Amino acid sequence: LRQEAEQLKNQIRDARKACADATLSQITNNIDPVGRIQMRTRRTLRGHLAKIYAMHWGTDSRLLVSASQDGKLIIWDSYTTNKVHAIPLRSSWVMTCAYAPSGNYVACGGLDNICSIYNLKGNVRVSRELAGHTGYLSCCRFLDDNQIVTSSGDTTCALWDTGQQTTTFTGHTGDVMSLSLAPDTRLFVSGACDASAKLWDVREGMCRQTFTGHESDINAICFFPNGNAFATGSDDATCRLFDLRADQELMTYSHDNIICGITSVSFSKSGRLLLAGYDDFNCNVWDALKADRAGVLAGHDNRVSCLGVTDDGMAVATGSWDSFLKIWN
Amino acid sequence: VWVVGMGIVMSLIVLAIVFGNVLVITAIAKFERLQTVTNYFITSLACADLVMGLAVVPFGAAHILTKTWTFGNFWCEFWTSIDVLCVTASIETLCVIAVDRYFAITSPFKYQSLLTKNKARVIILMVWIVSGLTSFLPIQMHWYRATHQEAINCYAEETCCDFFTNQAYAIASSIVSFYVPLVIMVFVYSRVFQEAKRQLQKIDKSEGRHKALKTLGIIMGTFTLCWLPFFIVNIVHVIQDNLIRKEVYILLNWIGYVNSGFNPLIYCRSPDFRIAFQELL
Amino acid sequence: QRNEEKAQREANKKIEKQLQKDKQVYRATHRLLLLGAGESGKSTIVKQMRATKVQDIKNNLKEAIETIVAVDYILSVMGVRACYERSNEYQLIDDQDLLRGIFETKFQVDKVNFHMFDVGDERRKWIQCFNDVTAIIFVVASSSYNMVIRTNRLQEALNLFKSIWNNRWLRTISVILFLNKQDLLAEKVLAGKSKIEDYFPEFARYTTPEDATPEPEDPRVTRAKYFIRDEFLRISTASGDGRHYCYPHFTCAVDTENIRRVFNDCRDIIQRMHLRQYELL
Amino acid sequence: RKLVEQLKMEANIDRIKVSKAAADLMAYCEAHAKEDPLLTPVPASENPFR
Numbered sequence: 001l002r003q004e005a006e007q008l009k010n011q012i013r014d015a016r017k018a019c020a021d022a023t024l025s026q027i028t029n030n031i032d033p034v035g036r037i038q039m040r041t042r043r044t045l046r047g048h049l050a051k052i053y054a055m056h057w058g059t060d061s062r063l064l065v066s067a068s069q070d071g072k073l074i075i076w077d078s079y080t081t082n083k084v085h086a087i088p089l090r091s092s093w094v095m096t097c098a099y100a101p102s103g104n105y106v107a108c109g110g111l112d113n114i115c116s117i118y119n120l121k122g123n124v125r126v127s128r129e130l131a132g133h134t135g136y137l138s139c140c141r142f143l144d145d146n147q148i149v150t151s152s153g154d155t156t157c158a159l160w161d162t163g164q165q166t167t168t169f170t171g172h173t174g175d176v177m178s179l180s181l182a183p184d185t186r187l188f189v190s191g192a193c194d195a196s197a198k199l200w201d202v203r204e205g206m207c208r209q210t211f212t213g214h215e216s217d218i219n220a221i222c223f224f225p226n227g228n229a230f231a232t233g234s235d236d237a238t239c240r241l242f243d244l245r246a247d248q249e250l251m252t253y254s255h256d257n258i259i260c261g262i263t264s265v266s267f268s269k270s271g272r273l274l275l276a277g278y279d280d281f282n283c284n285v286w287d288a289l290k291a292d293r294a295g296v297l298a299g300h301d302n303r304v305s306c307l308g309v310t311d312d313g314m315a316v317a318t319g320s321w322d323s324f325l326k327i328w329n
Numbered sequence: 330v331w332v333v334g335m336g337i338v339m340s341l342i343v344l345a346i347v348f349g350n351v352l353v354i355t356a357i358a359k360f361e362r363l364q365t366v367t368n369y370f371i372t373s374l375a376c377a378d379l380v381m382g383l384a385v386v387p388f389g390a391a392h393i394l395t396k397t398w399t400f401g402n403f404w405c406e407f408w409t410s411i412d413v414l415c416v417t418a419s420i421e422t423l424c425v426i427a428v429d430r431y432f433a434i435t436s437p438f439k440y441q442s443l444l445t446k447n448k449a450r451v452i453i454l455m456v457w458i459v460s461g462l463t464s465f466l467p468i469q470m471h472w473y474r475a476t477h478q479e480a481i482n483c484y485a486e487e488t489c490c491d492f493f494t495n496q497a498y499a500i501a502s503s504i505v506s507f508y509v510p511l512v513i514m515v516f517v518y519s520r521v522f523q524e525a526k527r528q529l530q531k532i533d534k535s536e537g538r539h540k541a542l543k544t545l546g547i548i549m550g551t552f553t554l555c556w557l558p559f560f561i562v563n564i565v566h567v568i569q570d571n572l573i574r575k576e577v578y579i580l581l582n583w584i585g586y587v588n589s590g591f592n593p594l595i596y597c598r599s600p601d602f603r604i605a606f607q608e609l610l
Numbered sequence: 611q612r613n614e615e616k617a618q619r620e621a622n623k624k625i626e627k628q629l630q631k632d633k634q635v636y637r638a639t640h641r642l643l644l645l646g647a648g649e650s651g652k653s654t655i656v657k658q659m660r661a662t663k664v665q666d667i668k669n670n671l672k673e674a675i676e677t678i679v680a681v682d683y684i685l686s687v688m689g690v691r692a693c694y695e696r697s698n699e700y701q702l703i704d705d706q707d708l709l710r711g712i713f714e715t716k717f718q719v720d721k722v723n724f725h726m727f728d729v730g731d732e733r734r735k736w737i738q739c740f741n742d743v744t745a746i747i748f749v750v751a752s753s754s755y756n757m758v759i760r761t762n763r764l765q766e767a768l769n770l771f772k773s774i775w776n777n778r779w780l781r782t783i784s785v786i787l788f789l790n791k792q793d794l795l796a797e798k799v800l801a802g803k804s805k806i807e808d809y810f811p812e813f814a815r816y817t818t819p820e821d822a823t824p825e826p827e828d829p830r831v832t833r834a835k836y837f838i839r840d841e842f843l844r845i846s847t848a849s850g851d852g853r854h855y856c857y858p859h860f861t862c863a864v865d866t867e868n869i870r871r872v873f874n875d876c877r878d879i880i881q882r883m884h885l886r887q888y889e890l891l
Numbered sequence: 892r893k894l895v896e897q898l899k900m901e902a903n904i905d906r907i908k909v910s911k912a913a914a915d916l917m918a919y920c921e922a923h924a925k926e927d928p929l930l931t932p933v934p935a936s937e938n939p940f941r
């Protein structure tokens with residue numbers, strides 16, 4: 001019964017070890033460090049009536065959407081600090097937000113199993129609230145203007161078209177808490193309450209690979225801009241980078257001083273800097289290749305809860321547990 | 330040599346008051362999270378303390394040490410105006426802080442709705458405006474000028490400038506500045522102490538397994554010991570001119586002045602304020 | 611250009627006014643979490659706070675029949691007292707007779723807005739989400755000791771309460787504790803079928819506290835309730851002091867005074883939070 | 892018991908050596924570095940925020 005599964009897992013571990021010719025840090029020792037980086041607060045967006053949970057940059061670098069526990073999902077203009085829209089969510093709580101690559105529609109999650117879709121483009125009206133799940137929602141994303149990928153409080157992650165769940169992924173021991181998409185729409189990856197982080201194929205609907213190098217709950221998953229890697233943020237202080245081709249943990253980012261959790265993880269336009277928010281009031285910036293911190297961003301008063309980087313890479317926006325959302329350039 | 334040490338002591342007192350008020354104002358203003366509804370009153374108190382410690386305390390030290398006022402009569406009248414305005418503003422801000430605590434404790438549910446940022450701004454503006462009406466107008470205009478034969482020459486003479494008030498203005502100014510706020514805060518803190526004792530008794534009753542005395546005691550005692558003796562001797566000297574000498578008046582006035590620098594030590598002991606002060610330095 | 615800027619400004623303004631009104635109404639209301647465990651009498655408190663329903667009742671009866679099964683005609687459709695006698699081993703569920711996703715309940719007690727939460731998760735990752743609620747209404751059934759899982763149900767509730775209490779994100783959140791099914795607890799205690807000491811060994815050495823005489827009940831029942839209350843209260847008391855208090859309330863299904871109790875206790879919680887602030891407590 | 896089948900399916904995949912993946916990642920990071928407004932200092936005129 002389980003003996004075959006144990007043997008298969010042992011064989012997979014042996015194969016992964018056999019592919020480890022050299023460590024990533026071994027190659028990176030020749031490269032020069034990025035050096036110390038000083039990050040200023042270009043703007044401090046404010047106005048939220050309560051704590052915020054997640055935010056997503058727009059397809060353009062200007063517009064962004066912020067989601068708060070107060071139910072007020074307000075669209076923001078980063079350049080001129082203007083609240084273009086204020087959409088009061090039907091559900092009292094939201095846990096994630098998403099912005100269409102077309103920019104026409106805006107997605108909001110929620111503690112309620114129902115996922116709502118707002119058609120921003122006079123007055124905002126909900127387009128079609130999704131069917132639901134058995135549990136809450138964790139992260140949402142837009143493959144296109146017609147398909148939204150949702151992560152649930154149960155195992156199942158789903159692709160939604162019509163209020164119909166075209167596919168229903170499964171295989172997670174716990175609850176999926178975050179996901180990210182590749183530059184192409186073919187592949188995407190997701191975390192879980194358990195240490196397992198998996199990669200799914202949207203067309204096939206089967207988890208091609210599974211990475212389980214962590215030891216605590218995974219709270220954030222970012223995707224490499226190249227599309228061949230993805231970074232995980234665990235409940236414990238360690239954040240690590242996985243390579244899809246190598247299918248293991250290439251590098252591990254951690255420090256003795258940091259003991260707090262990690263809430264959001266995002267890369268830069270070039271992928272050199274891994275901007276990771278922490279459960280502490282600060283936000284760290286790590287040199288991805290060299291695994292060395294290159295600055296500390298501690299603007300917020302409360303714990304950070306979201307990060308993001310514009311498609312042009314002009315600036316990185318961090319949203320905290322406090323009402324203040326600060327754009328860092 | 331006695332005057333030389335007194336000058337150093339006065340300079341140290343003025344510097345301490347200025348530094349404390351500046352630190353409190355910077356901590357309140359720089360950090361948005363630290364600023365709140367009730368921190369506007371502390372901001373007003375710190376601003377009043379800073380203005381007093383930069384306007385009257387150094388000028389008062391210059392007057393007492395040299396024993397000759399170099400500035401003109403109008404400038405001395407303006408200086409006394411600023412002094413009295415600052416004192417009333419500080420005491421009324423203490424009273425407003427006390428009544429805010431009373432509203433927050435005795436009526437918890439109605440506290441958040443009744444008081445807002447606009448409400449705090451308007452009440453602080455009203456406090457400053459009533460302080461101005463009590464201080465500036467009766468003293469900028471010559472209502473307060475003494476009708477006594479004494480000090481008529483002193484008011485006429487440019488170099489000499491000592492406070493000789495009418496028998497009527499002194500009592501009214503004291504009542505608006507200290508006595509009424511004293512009664513208000515004493516009653517308010519008695520009510521808050523009763524509520525704290527009730528809560529402690531309830532906690533003891535529910536769970537089988539002097540803190541309120543210390544905080545209330547220090548908060549009320551500092552203010553009372555600093556200001557009450559001065560605001561009683563100023564009335565006594567009006568009632569009985571032979572009872573009070575000038576040196577006693579000056580000493581009590583400056584002991585009351587030191588309360589301006591003492592206030593930040595009693596209204597910034599919260600851990601958030603300490604963290605903000607550590608971060609700022 | 612200029613026109614675009616003007617438009618943006620006008621929209622921001624329209625939003626800012628609406629958002630100020632929204633912040634006012636949001637600060638007016640309060641948030642409460644209901645942590646009622648599965649089949650722990652949580653629905654009784656909500657009912658106490660306040661065709662298709664007949665079909666739902668019939669479905670509940672069918673589910674109870676299926677649970678009992680887990681005569682021949684009854685079994686094929688899907689000794690009656692035997693299941694009820696052994697109802698402790700297995701989990702079993704159950705106008706006036708009928709009464710006897712996330713759910714939100716809104717009610718007002720003394721013209722003060724209240725808002726009630728109802729979620730329901732072994733991981734309980736959503737617990738850290740509610741770090742801003744006024745208080746947590748955690749209900750529990752004192753009769754759950756007889757029911758056995760696989761740790762007894764009451765022990766499981768104690769473990770859940772301990773996990774909730776010692777949480778980093780809930781360091782400033784109080785808990786209101788309701789012990790449902792007091793009459794059922796008395797009925798089970800009077801009968802010798804289940805002994806409290808048999809399940810909880812510490813009850814043999816336990817004795818009733820001297821100053822605890824709440825109701826006109828045989829001594830044994832009161833000793834049982836006070837044991838359960840002390841077992842709940844010890845985990846809350848030993849963890850720490852300040853911004854953490856448990857408020858056990860012995861309640862019956864019939865009693866309708868709970869709505870007043872939650873209001874009074876939430877007022878006490880806000881008052882004690884303010885008292886702990888300002889360094890008074 | 893489909894977990895063992897899924898594990899067997901995932902195991903039957905070709906793996907790229909870690910050295911090659913690291914070299915490719917370093918090459919991409921070095922090639923796209925000049926286009927990162929965060930890695931290099933943000934010019935005052937170029938940056939819309941400042």
Ligand SMILES: CN[C@@H]1CCc2c(ccc(O)c2O)[C@H]1O
Nearest residue numbers: 412413416417492502503506582
């Ligand atoms: C130099 N003495 C001045 C004049 C009288 C006076 C003071 C302070 C507060 C008042 O309400 C007063 O009426 C003193 O600072």
